[PDB]
Structure 1
């Protein structure tokens, strides 16, 4: 509008609808559909099965963190000096405890997520926030005063970010194309394509 008299923007009639028209005559897709393994892992019906499918990620991360710390210790120990203590007896607790505590946190997260979704019956932000809150509460059992508040908040915030930018964001902008005519505006005279552009093939790595 760019004037001080009438409101900016505009309005669209709710009664009037515009027939969908295809962005191109022939559609060639280079985006592959979800695999059956992805649908299997995403399935939260059985909370035990959902937990056991998704924990290997957490155990892997804990193992890398423990291996990093254990190597930092091993690198320091002197080879030239013979050591009275056994190095692996020193180093194994590091890796084992890191992996175990990581797996326990991930197990709480996944189990609470699946249990809340089953009980609620709906897929929602709240399941992730509650699972994260429980995981952060387990993180800060005996920790000093700011941490009982901050860790539930951070661990709850993480699934919100994952949902917002992993699921809502892609689905909100599926229709936008960038070629031919703007998705809302097909009445405008822009070059109309026979085929959509293929900038790359379906990946296979």
Structure 2
């Protein structure tokens, strides 16, 4: 409007609908659909199955962290001097404990997420928040004062961030095209494509 007399923006009729018009005459899709593996892992029906399918990721991350710390300890120890102690006995707890703690935290998160979703019966943000909060509570069992408040918050926030930018964002902005005519405005006289642009072939790596 760019005036001071009437409200800015506009209004669209709710009664009047515009019949959908295809973006192009022929649509070629270079985006592959989700794999059967993805759907299997995503299935939260059985909490135990869901947990056991998704823990490998947490275990791997714990193993990488433990390997990192163990290597740092091993690198410093001197080869030239003989050591009374056994290095593996010193280093094995590091890796084992890190992997176990990571797996336990990821198990708690996955279990609570599946159990809440089943009990509630709906896929919602709350399920992620309560799983994160429970994981952060387990993380901060014996930590000083600030940490009990901070970790349940950071952990609860992480599934919120994942849901907003991993699931809601793409579905929200699926229609936008970028070529031909703007999604909403097809009356405007813009070049109309016979086929959609294919910027890349479907990936295979």
TM-score per shorter chain, which class?
Answer: over 0.9
Structure 1 residue 193 displacement after superposition: 0.2
Structure 1 residue 100 displacement after superposition: 0.0
Provide TM-score, normalisation by structure 2.
1.00
Map of 1:1-12 to 2, 5 A cutoff?
Answer: 1-12=1-12
Structure 1 residue 105 displacement after superposition: 0.1
Residue 15 of structure 2: aligned partner = 15
Structure 1 residue 59 displacement after superposition: 0.2
Looking at structure 2, the residues matched to 42 and 162 of structure 1 have their Cα atoms a distance apart, in angstroms, of: 14
Render the CA deviation track for 1:71-104: whole Å, top value 9, x for unaligned: 0000000000000000000000000000000000
Structure 1 residue 143 displacement after superposition: 0.2
Looking at structure 2, the residues matched to 134 and 165 of structure 1 have their Cα atoms a distance apart, in angstroms, of: 22
Q: Secondary structure at the match of 2:200?
A: coil
Looking at structure 2, the residues matched to 86 and 182 of structure 1 have their Cα atoms a distance apart, in angstroms, of: 69
User: How many residues matched?
Assistant: 205
Gaps (5+ residues) in structure 2?
none
Q: Which runs of 4+ in 1 moved over 3 A?
A: none
Q: Secondary structure at the match of 1:25?
A: coil
Q: Secondary structure at the match of 1:14?
A: coil
Render the CA deviation track for 1:136-174: whole Å, top value 9, x for unaligned: 000000000000000000000000000000000000000
Q: Secondary structure at the match of 2:63?
A: helix
Q: Secondary structure at the match of 1:17?
A: coil
Structure 1 residue 189 displacement after superposition: 0.1
Structure 1 residue 62 displacement after superposition: 0.2
Q: Aligned-pair RMSD on alpha carbons?
A: 0.2
Structure 1 residue 177 displacement after superposition: 0.0
Looking at structure 2, the residues matched to 183 and 148 of structure 1 have their Cα atoms a distance apart, in angstroms, of: 47
Gaps (5+ residues) in structure 1?
none
Residue 32 of structure 1: aligned partner = 32
Q: Secondary structure at the match of 2:109?
A: helix
Looking at structure 2, the residues matched to 114 and 187 of structure 1 have their Cα atoms a distance apart, in angstroms, of: 47
Structure 1 residue 32 displacement after superposition: 0.2
Residue 100 of structure 2: aligned partner = 100
Looking at structure 1, the residues matched to 185 and 201 of structure 2 have their Cα atoms a distance apart, in angstroms, of: 29
Structure 1 residue 120 displacement after superposition: 0.1
Structure 1 residue 183 displacement after superposition: 0.2
Q: Secondary structure at the match of 2:39?
A: helix
Q: Secondary structure at the match of 2:27?
A: coil
Looking at structure 1, the residues matched to 200 and 177 of structure 2 have their Cα atoms a distance apart, in angstroms, of: 15
Structure 1 residue 131 displacement after superposition: 0.2
